[PDB]
Amino acid sequence: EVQLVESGGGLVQPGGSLRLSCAASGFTVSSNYMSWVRQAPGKGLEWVSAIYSGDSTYYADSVKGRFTISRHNPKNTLYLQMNSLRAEDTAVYYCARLVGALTNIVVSGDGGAFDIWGQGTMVTVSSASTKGPSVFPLAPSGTAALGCLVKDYFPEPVTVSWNSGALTSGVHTFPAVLQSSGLYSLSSVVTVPSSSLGTQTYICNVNHKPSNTKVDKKVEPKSC
Amino acid sequence: SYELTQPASVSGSPGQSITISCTGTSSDVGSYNLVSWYQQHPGKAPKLMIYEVSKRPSGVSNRFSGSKSGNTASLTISGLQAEDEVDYYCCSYAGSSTWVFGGGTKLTVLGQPKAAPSVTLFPPSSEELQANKATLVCLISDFYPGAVTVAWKADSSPVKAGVETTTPSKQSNNKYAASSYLSLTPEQWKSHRSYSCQVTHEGSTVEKTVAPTEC
Amino acid sequence: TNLCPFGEVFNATRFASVYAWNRKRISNCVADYSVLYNSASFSTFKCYGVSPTKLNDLCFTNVYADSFVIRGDEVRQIAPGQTGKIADYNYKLPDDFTGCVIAWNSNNLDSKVGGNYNYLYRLFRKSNLKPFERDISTEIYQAGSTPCNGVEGFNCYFPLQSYGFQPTNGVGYQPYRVVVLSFELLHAPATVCGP
Ligand SMILES: *[C@@H]1O[C@H](CO[C@@H]2O[C@@H](C)[C@@H](O)[C@@H](O)[C@@H]2O)[C@@H](O[C@@H]2O[C@H](CO)[C@@H](O)[C@H](O)[C@H]2NC(C)=O)[C@H](O)[C@H]1NC(C)=O
């Protein structure tokens, strides 16, 4: 049951600051080498920082002097303090365990690899203001496709559930489009039995935390 | 920033072997036995496949092997499987407690059965039309290979104004998905007879049509 | 006629860390070891090469008292022939040891809420200590094949670690004060005799 869970990601203005956290379970950050690794959307992995014994810290030159890696052992948590943020720092930030010579899954040798990873937390550095989405129903017209459109939001991400999570089969939330306006739009569609149309209630629960937008939208067959 | 150099893309046929290279310099790959390799599915964290040039973590298939020569490390994948069509990254110690990743390689596994795209086209909702906006929504799913072109039509006339189309994205089932939005004024939507979304995949074209409601 | 100053050893107000273990020479005095051996204050009192009951009948050239703090589950390492982090890297008795090992729980003095971190031990070393060798160096320890360049980092460790003595630790992790008495016989008149 080893796990890493990052949090703290969000929208920041250039020059701003943000602190990420990475909560470990099943093992202790105090007894392991740890690192932050980031990934710009659609781009590759970039090593950011590492921490070793004695809280000895090391950084990529791309962030040196602006970022600080640290640990709080009682909370079993790794942090990344990011100052003087730039648009080029926009990325998903992952925390990972860096295997070393003394790691228990090493039999001999030096380790030197990232074997435990979190899910990542998204950091957007932009001067654009956060904008909550407008949610519209995509009505049904035996299988039936219904859905909802999450329009003109910023920044990523948005979470979409159906019937507060009870409905998961046939659900397909599509990757968002980034419009020329700089705003995102996505759609979520579920395939359901046609015979359930008009008797089973279908609600898409849309959440855009950056703007604190939670919207429950009922998708109903079209009635003229 | 400084990175190890990997081919952007490689392709192989099932049952065959494929090698992905990872070129650094004498002060990283060429100095240490600390090369690791990772597999990454879209939207997921990387998975460690190889470390210390050639070692496999417990549970990783022996289809994956690593080696190095001079400043270049290589990952070789044998018995290629549809599951392998993912991104791969190399990483090396870069001296003095630092690490450097390669730019990543997208692996394509050829010879898989072609899968045509399922299309769903929605017209603008009545709420949005009440807000003085119109958006037609064209969803494309379950296609392989992961490449499509999208063209919109208004009564058989070409439409390029208002089209925003995503890149294809790999699904859990090893097929791909994409979407296309057409923004129209309420007036334009209702002035035309119908509207259509045409997705072209491996030569074939699949189209869907909508039109303003009857009442 | 003067009594050996064992009080200065057993009732010292400060005890050394084990890696920097302290030695006191005792000479030209009368040693009543039976009062020590019959004292209820000691969790551990084991002699090697001598009978504890017969020590009051013997005369030695000198006596050495080595003292330090370790954790309880390490007291077993302060004995001839043993291995582990303390015997290997911090304090090593010879196979042919002639002396006594004395220990007692010091949780009431050496633990504190939040942890007492004043006491250290050597966690890493390139080779095992010889008997009665003492290493107080603090070079960075290279646990892998890559260089340390004099600083901590990847597979490169500061060689000392602190015990974290907290009052609620189990006994195996509680602090124990330890006194090792060595009995030395040279080609000289004895100066430390029993009563
Ligand atoms: C180590 O000290 C104990 C305790 O000594 C008393 O308490 C100390 C805190 C300090 O105030 C001393 O000056 C005190 O005398 C010694 O135990 C005493 O031993 C004498 C002689 O055997 C006996 O008369 C007392 O009753 C003992 N006191 C108690 C509380 O039991 C002990 O002997 C000393 N150890 C050595 C090796 O000298």
Side-chain angles (χ1 to χ4, degrees), chain A residues 33 52-54 56 58 98-102 110-112, chain C residues 124 143-146 148 151-158:
Chain A
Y33 300 161
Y52 307 91
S53 66
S56 53
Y58 294 81
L98 169 63
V99 177
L102 307 198
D110 287 2
Chain C
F124 299 111
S145 300
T146 56
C148 305
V151 294
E152 299 195 86
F154 179 61
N155 294 331
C156 288
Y157 291 88
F158 194 74

Tab-separated table of all heavy atoms in Angstrom, chain A residues 33 52-54 56 58 98-102 110-112, chain C residues 124 143-146 148 151-158:
chain	number	residue	atom	x	y	z
A	33	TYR	N	15.287	8.733	-0.479
A	33	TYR	CA	15.543	9.800	-1.426
A	33	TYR	C	14.249	10.128	-2.152
A	33	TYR	O	13.498	9.233	-2.539
A	33	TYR	CB	16.601	9.365	-2.427
A	33	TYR	CG	17.926	9.002	-1.818
A	33	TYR	CD1	18.817	8.233	-2.533
A	33	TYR	CD2	18.300	9.428	-0.537
A	33	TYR	CE1	20.058	7.918	-2.034
A	33	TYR	CE2	19.541	9.098	-0.023
A	33	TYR	CZ	20.419	8.361	-0.791
A	33	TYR	OH	21.669	8.025	-0.373
A	52	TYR	N	18.166	14.151	-0.379
A	52	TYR	CA	18.856	12.952	0.081
A	52	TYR	C	19.064	13.013	1.589
A	52	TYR	O	18.379	13.765	2.281
A	52	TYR	CB	20.175	12.834	-0.658
A	52	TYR	CG	20.068	12.895	-2.147
A	52	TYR	CD1	20.156	14.100	-2.827
A	52	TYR	CD2	19.909	11.734	-2.888
A	52	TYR	CE1	20.081	14.145	-4.238
A	52	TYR	CE2	19.837	11.770	-4.293
A	52	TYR	CZ	19.923	12.966	-4.939
A	52	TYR	OH	19.868	12.981	-6.315
A	53	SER	N	19.998	12.237	2.128
A	53	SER	CA	20.171	12.217	3.571
A	53	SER	C	20.645	13.580	4.087
A	53	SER	O	21.279	14.369	3.382
A	53	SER	CB	21.148	11.099	3.986
A	53	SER	OG	22.457	11.365	3.512
A	54	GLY	N	20.338	13.851	5.347
A	54	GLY	CA	20.640	15.151	5.928
A	54	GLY	C	19.893	16.321	5.311
A	54	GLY	O	20.313	17.462	5.463
A	56	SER	N	19.933	17.118	2.309
A	56	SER	CA	20.789	17.679	1.264
A	56	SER	C	19.996	17.794	-0.033
A	56	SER	O	19.356	16.839	-0.479
A	56	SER	CB	22.043	16.830	1.073
A	56	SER	OG	21.742	15.459	0.854
A	58	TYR	N	19.259	19.259	-4.106
A	58	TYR	CA	19.837	19.505	-5.413
A	58	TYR	C	18.727	19.853	-6.385
A	58	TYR	O	17.579	19.415	-6.222
A	58	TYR	CB	20.612	18.299	-5.905
A	58	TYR	CG	21.822	17.973	-5.100
A	58	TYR	CD1	21.716	17.253	-3.908
A	58	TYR	CD2	23.091	18.396	-5.509
A	58	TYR	CE1	22.849	16.942	-3.150
A	58	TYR	CE2	24.226	18.068	-4.765
A	58	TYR	CZ	24.087	17.347	-3.606
A	58	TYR	OH	25.193	17.028	-2.875
A	98	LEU	N	13.150	8.028	-5.149
A	98	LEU	CA	14.380	7.737	-5.885
A	98	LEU	C	15.085	6.592	-5.168
A	98	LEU	O	15.531	6.732	-4.017
A	98	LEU	CB	15.254	8.985	-5.992
A	98	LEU	CG	16.672	8.773	-6.513
A	98	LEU	CD1	16.666	8.257	-7.894
A	98	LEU	CD2	17.403	10.116	-6.396
A	99	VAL	N	15.119	5.434	-5.826
A	99	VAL	CA	15.799	4.279	-5.259
A	99	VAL	C	17.279	4.572	-5.128
A	99	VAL	O	17.901	5.161	-6.018
A	99	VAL	CB	15.558	3.042	-6.147
A	99	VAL	CG1	16.307	1.868	-5.613
A	99	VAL	CG2	14.046	2.770	-6.256
A	100	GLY	N	17.854	4.141	-4.011
A	100	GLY	CA	19.280	4.217	-3.786
A	100	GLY	C	19.862	2.887	-3.376
A	100	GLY	O	19.160	1.857	-3.331
A	101	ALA	N	21.154	2.897	-3.047
A	101	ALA	CA	21.848	1.663	-2.716
A	101	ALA	C	21.259	0.971	-1.505
A	101	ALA	O	21.301	-0.257	-1.418
A	101	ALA	CB	23.324	1.947	-2.463
A	102	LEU	N	20.712	1.729	-0.562
A	102	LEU	CA	20.170	1.167	0.669
A	102	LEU	C	18.663	0.931	0.625
A	102	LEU	O	18.090	0.495	1.615
A	102	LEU	CB	20.531	2.081	1.854
A	102	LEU	CG	22.027	2.390	1.953
A	102	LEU	CD1	22.404	2.912	3.341
A	102	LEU	CD2	22.887	1.156	1.629
A	110	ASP	N	23.463	0.311	-6.983
A	110	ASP	CA	23.298	1.704	-6.603
A	110	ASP	C	21.881	2.237	-6.729
A	110	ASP	O	21.623	3.364	-6.297
A	110	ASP	CB	24.218	2.597	-7.457
A	110	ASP	CG	25.684	2.481	-7.074
A	110	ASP	OD1	26.034	1.682	-6.172
A	110	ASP	OD2	26.485	3.180	-7.705
A	111	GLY	N	20.959	1.487	-7.303
A	111	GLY	CA	19.628	2.036	-7.515
A	111	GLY	C	19.637	3.065	-8.636
A	111	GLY	O	20.055	2.781	-9.758
A	112	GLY	N	19.169	4.270	-8.354
A	112	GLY	CA	19.258	5.342	-9.325
A	112	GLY	C	18.099	5.402	-10.299
A	112	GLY	O	18.289	5.579	-11.500
C	124	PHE	N	27.714	4.015	9.484
C	124	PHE	CA	28.418	3.574	8.295
C	124	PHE	C	29.912	3.640	8.546
C	124	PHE	O	30.406	4.603	9.149
C	124	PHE	CB	28.110	4.489	7.076
C	124	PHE	CG	26.678	4.533	6.676
C	124	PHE	CD1	25.941	5.680	6.856
C	124	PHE	CD2	26.061	3.429	6.121
C	124	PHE	CE1	24.624	5.738	6.489
C	124	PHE	CE2	24.736	3.488	5.742
C	124	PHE	CZ	24.030	4.655	5.918
C	143	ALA	N	28.337	5.102	-0.111
C	143	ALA	CA	27.626	3.830	-0.122
C	143	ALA	C	27.471	3.229	-1.508
C	143	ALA	O	27.068	2.062	-1.615
C	143	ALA	CB	26.237	4.015	0.506
C	144	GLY	N	27.726	3.987	-2.574
C	144	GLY	CA	27.613	3.475	-3.935
C	144	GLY	C	28.913	3.653	-4.705
C	144	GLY	O	29.958	3.894	-4.101
C	145	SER	N	28.864	3.587	-6.031
C	145	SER	CA	30.067	3.717	-6.845
C	145	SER	C	30.345	5.141	-7.284
C	145	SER	O	31.391	5.387	-7.882
C	145	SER	CB	29.956	2.837	-8.095
C	145	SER	OG	29.807	1.483	-7.723
C	146	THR	N	29.423	6.081	-7.046
C	146	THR	CA	29.641	7.450	-7.506
C	146	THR	C	30.243	8.326	-6.413
C	146	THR	O	30.033	8.099	-5.211
C	146	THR	CB	28.311	8.053	-8.006
C	146	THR	OG1	27.336	7.972	-6.953
C	146	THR	CG2	27.816	7.295	-9.191
C	148	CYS	N	31.314	11.406	-3.809
C	148	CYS	CA	30.557	12.305	-2.940
C	148	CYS	C	31.041	13.745	-2.982
C	148	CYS	O	30.274	14.659	-2.655
C	148	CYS	CB	30.613	11.790	-1.493
C	148	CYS	SG	30.028	10.032	-1.383
C	151	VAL	N	30.293	16.003	0.200
C	151	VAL	CA	28.982	16.450	0.642
C	151	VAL	C	28.017	15.279	0.584
C	151	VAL	O	28.224	14.310	-0.147
C	151	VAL	CB	28.441	17.641	-0.177
C	151	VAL	CG1	29.326	18.859	0.073
C	151	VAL	CG2	28.378	17.357	-1.683
C	152	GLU	N	26.961	15.375	1.386
C	152	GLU	CA	25.890	14.404	1.302
C	152	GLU	C	25.151	14.544	-0.024
C	152	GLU	O	25.034	15.637	-0.602
C	152	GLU	CB	24.885	14.557	2.464
C	152	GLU	CG	25.477	14.350	3.846
C	152	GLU	CD	24.421	14.146	4.946
C	152	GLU	OE1	23.936	12.983	5.201
C	152	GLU	OE2	24.102	15.169	5.574
C	153	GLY	N	24.615	13.422	-0.492
C	153	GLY	CA	23.844	13.392	-1.720
C	153	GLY	C	23.525	11.966	-2.093
C	153	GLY	O	23.403	11.100	-1.228
C	154	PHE	N	23.447	11.712	-3.387
C	154	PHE	CA	23.059	10.388	-3.857
C	154	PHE	C	24.048	9.330	-3.394
C	154	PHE	O	25.236	9.375	-3.751
C	154	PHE	CB	22.949	10.390	-5.376
C	154	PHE	CG	22.583	9.057	-5.955
C	154	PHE	CD1	21.382	8.448	-5.617
C	154	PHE	CD2	23.403	8.442	-6.881
C	154	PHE	CE1	21.001	7.227	-6.199
C	154	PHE	CE2	23.028	7.201	-7.474
C	154	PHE	CZ	21.830	6.599	-7.127
C	155	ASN	N	23.557	8.392	-2.567
C	155	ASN	CA	24.356	7.317	-1.964
C	155	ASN	C	25.579	7.828	-1.215
C	155	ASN	O	26.589	7.122	-1.073
C	155	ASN	CB	24.740	6.278	-3.025
C	155	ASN	CG	23.537	5.541	-3.573
C	155	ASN	OD1	22.525	5.359	-2.882
C	155	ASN	ND2	23.634	5.092	-4.795
C	156	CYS	N	25.483	9.021	-0.647
C	156	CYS	CA	26.590	9.664	0.055
C	156	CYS	C	26.066	10.226	1.365
C	156	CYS	O	25.274	11.159	1.359
C	156	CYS	CB	27.207	10.755	-0.818
C	156	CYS	SG	28.165	10.064	-2.243
C	157	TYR	N	26.526	9.670	2.478
C	157	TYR	CA	25.887	9.881	3.776
C	157	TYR	C	26.826	10.473	4.819
C	157	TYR	O	27.984	10.055	4.940
C	157	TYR	CB	25.391	8.550	4.347
C	157	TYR	CG	24.241	7.874	3.661
C	157	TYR	CD1	24.465	7.008	2.604
C	157	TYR	CD2	22.950	8.064	4.097
C	157	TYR	CE1	23.438	6.349	2.003
C	157	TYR	CE2	21.896	7.439	3.490
C	157	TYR	CZ	22.141	6.581	2.436
C	157	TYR	OH	21.130	5.925	1.822
C	158	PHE	N	26.323	11.402	5.612
C	158	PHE	CA	27.009	11.713	6.857
C	158	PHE	C	27.060	10.448	7.713
C	158	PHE	O	26.097	9.685	7.749
C	158	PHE	CB	26.293	12.844	7.585
C	158	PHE	CG	27.113	13.424	8.679
C	158	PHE	CD1	28.209	14.255	8.391
C	158	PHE	CD2	26.820	13.138	10.001
C	158	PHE	CE1	28.975	14.796	9.427
C	158	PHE	CE2	27.589	13.675	11.024
C	158	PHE	CZ	28.672	14.491	10.733
